[PDB]
Design an enzyme around this catalytic site. Structure first.
Site, PDB file in Angstrom:
ATOM      1  N   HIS D  39       0.722  -1.375  -0.087  1.00 46.26           N
ATOM      2  CA  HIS D  39      -0.027   0.046  -0.129  1.00 46.26           C
ATOM      3  C   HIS D  39       0.986   1.103  -0.189  1.00 46.26           C
ATOM      4  CE1 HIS D  39       1.050  -0.716   4.448  1.00 46.26           C
ATOM      5  NE2 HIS D  39       0.602   0.665   4.406  1.00 46.26           N
ATOM      6  N   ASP D  61      -0.938  -7.230   1.284  1.00 49.40           N
ATOM      7  CA  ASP D  61      -0.538  -6.300   0.781  1.00 49.40           C
ATOM      8  C   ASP D  61       0.846  -6.059   1.027  1.00 49.40           C
ATOM      9  OD1 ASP D  61      -3.355  -5.090  -0.156  1.00 49.40           O
ATOM     10  OD2 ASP D  61      -3.967  -5.243   2.256  1.00 49.40           O
ATOM     11  N   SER D 113       4.071   2.412   8.677  1.00 51.24           N
ATOM     12  CA  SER D 113       4.116   1.179   8.190  1.00 51.24           C
ATOM     13  C   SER D 113       5.580   0.538   7.737  1.00 51.24           C
ATOM     14  CB  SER D 113       3.409   1.049   6.983  1.00 51.24           C
ATOM     15  OG  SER D 113       1.839   1.394   7.310  1.00 51.24           O
TER      16      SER D 113
END
Lengths: 162, 52, 162, 162, 162
Positions: D39, D61, D113
């Site tokens: 992502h 992802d 992330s």
């Protein structure tokens, strides 16, 4: 005074327009809705504010967008009382005379678009969009609003986009 | 048509050779820090060379 | 000496080639016209100089462009007197022998392309484009110009683009 | 402890994902092969690592790619021993309970992330991909691997991509 | 040194070109014959010298005239030995390099045409006719003569008549 003006500008949510790591201008929130000079390219230095879709106004080369009420909580306070005298802004003082704002030469340059003009009470009276060399001083091209709500843009002849 | 095609191929080859020669000539005609290269053009005279 | 060399390189307008915030090389102005290694991608760290259109020279993997005379005012001074001995550059000294420039191992790497070589008088004698591991030292691939104006590129066999 | 964790994360080759000069995430090398959250858009802050072609895994992802053995020399050490207690990561500590990782509120946001979770020995036990507001704390969406080599992704209901 | 140069220029008969009370240039006598820049209008500040009829030379924008031998008694001494280094003139020093004369910026302006350049022995080596802005310095457009008697005019591209 300038210290207090800078403190008020920083405490109020104001964010420069970043493009490739370069400050190309500034944008602020007044009256609870964001405004941005159209000629300046880039995105506001705020992801939450960047999420807001802007509308264009070619006539004044300015953009506007709706700000969430929760973020409308603390924005610039505008006033229509604009008597002659001197005001304060990011790069010092500004002289208001004959309906025009002027500052000493060497103050203001490309990338300063968006800096508001504050009164002694810290209320916004005008927004600086550009300027033009005026010898010992320079005259800024600004927009101001009367008590009737009329948008008036003062642009010197052959004014440069600063 | 065969003769015309052969002539066209010959012209294209000549043009390519001229372009390669121009590139080779411009190779010493690079900056060569002096901002002045009259003498390379005067000696080689590859094309569009020394006015004098 | 190295201090003075760095001071002269900084005072003279020299600008690294920035790409995505990374220094991928260097470019300088010598003899009043800008040169740039073709293999290095990016734009010069000078908006005014970036406005200049460059021409390509595949044979030497170098580019060149015209610099305005007002900016030609202060550029590198080139000389053709290249006797054997030692010279100075950004990362220290360089040994010149047999017509080749060599520096001690561990000096120079990818991203140093464009650094000129200066003599005791501060005049440019060569431009460093690459190098190759040479044991206790490393040999740099450079271009130098004789008093007759002939461009000569010395490239070691299997030289790496540094 | 946090100082040592940051030192270990910096010494080990880790590079944020830069896009237009903005840090949009992080990527690291564990077990000798690079992983990247799908992502997050942009390129790793390493030209050599950017040269590696990645493969996509929509289900989690996440992306992965092969790292050269010479660069596999120093990567993260993974372990399967994940007892209940507290672990350390870039923004402080993390509580592990009921098979889920939780951190105090205000820790973690969009752009974090890719940050791994380390044990007392500095071994990776999980990778942080997102999170969701959990009142006085926030619960992170992470992936962990058992001693049998099974990839398990724990995702809170209506978890936001952080 | 500059004091001695000014004393030598004053003792030797030199006269500015007066027009309506304004100094528009200068003229001097070298080798026993008067020279005057053609672009400068007005009459020499000497009635006796003004009586001399001049001849035009469009190619160099210069004029010349015969001076009586009795007045040829004391004129400028010319030399052809022009090595690299520094020379002296009315407004200070001048740098000679690559066959061109250059002086620091801010030295020389409209109305200085006609000032000669003197060596350490007080001999004329060149005549200043104009100049062009060269950043930190300015390059003067001058005429010099070799030992073979060849008149050579060095004119920078887009040089202004100073």
């Amino acid at each position: 005074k300038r210290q207090r003006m800078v403190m008020k500008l920083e405490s109020d949510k104001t964010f420069p327009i970043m493009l490739e790591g370069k400050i190309n201008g500034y944008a602020c929130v007044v009256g609870g809705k964001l405004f941005r000079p159209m000629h300046v390219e880039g995105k506001i230095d705020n992801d939450v504010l960047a999420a807001l879709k802007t509308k264009k106004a070619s006539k004044y080369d300015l953009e506007y967008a709706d700000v969430p009420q929760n973020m409308r909580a603390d924005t610039f306070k505008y006033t229509h009382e604009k008597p002659q005298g001197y005001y304060s802004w990011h790069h010092g003082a500004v002289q208001y005379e004959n309906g025009r704002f002027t500052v000493p030469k060497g103050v203001g340059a490309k990338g300063d678009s968006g800096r508001p003009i504050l009164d002694n009470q810290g209320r916004v009276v005008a927004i600086v969009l550009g300027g033009v060399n005026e010898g010992s001083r320079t005259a800024l091209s600004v927009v101001m609003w009367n008590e009737k709500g009329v948008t008036v843009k003062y642009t010197p002849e052959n004014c440069e986009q600063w | 048509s065969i003769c015309a095609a052969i002539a066209t191929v010959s012209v294209a080859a000549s043009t390519w050779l001229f372009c390669r020669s121009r590139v080779a000539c411009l190779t010493p005609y690079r900056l060569t820090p002096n901002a002045r290269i009259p003498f390379c053009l005067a000696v080689l005279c590859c094309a569009r060379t020394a006015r004098a």
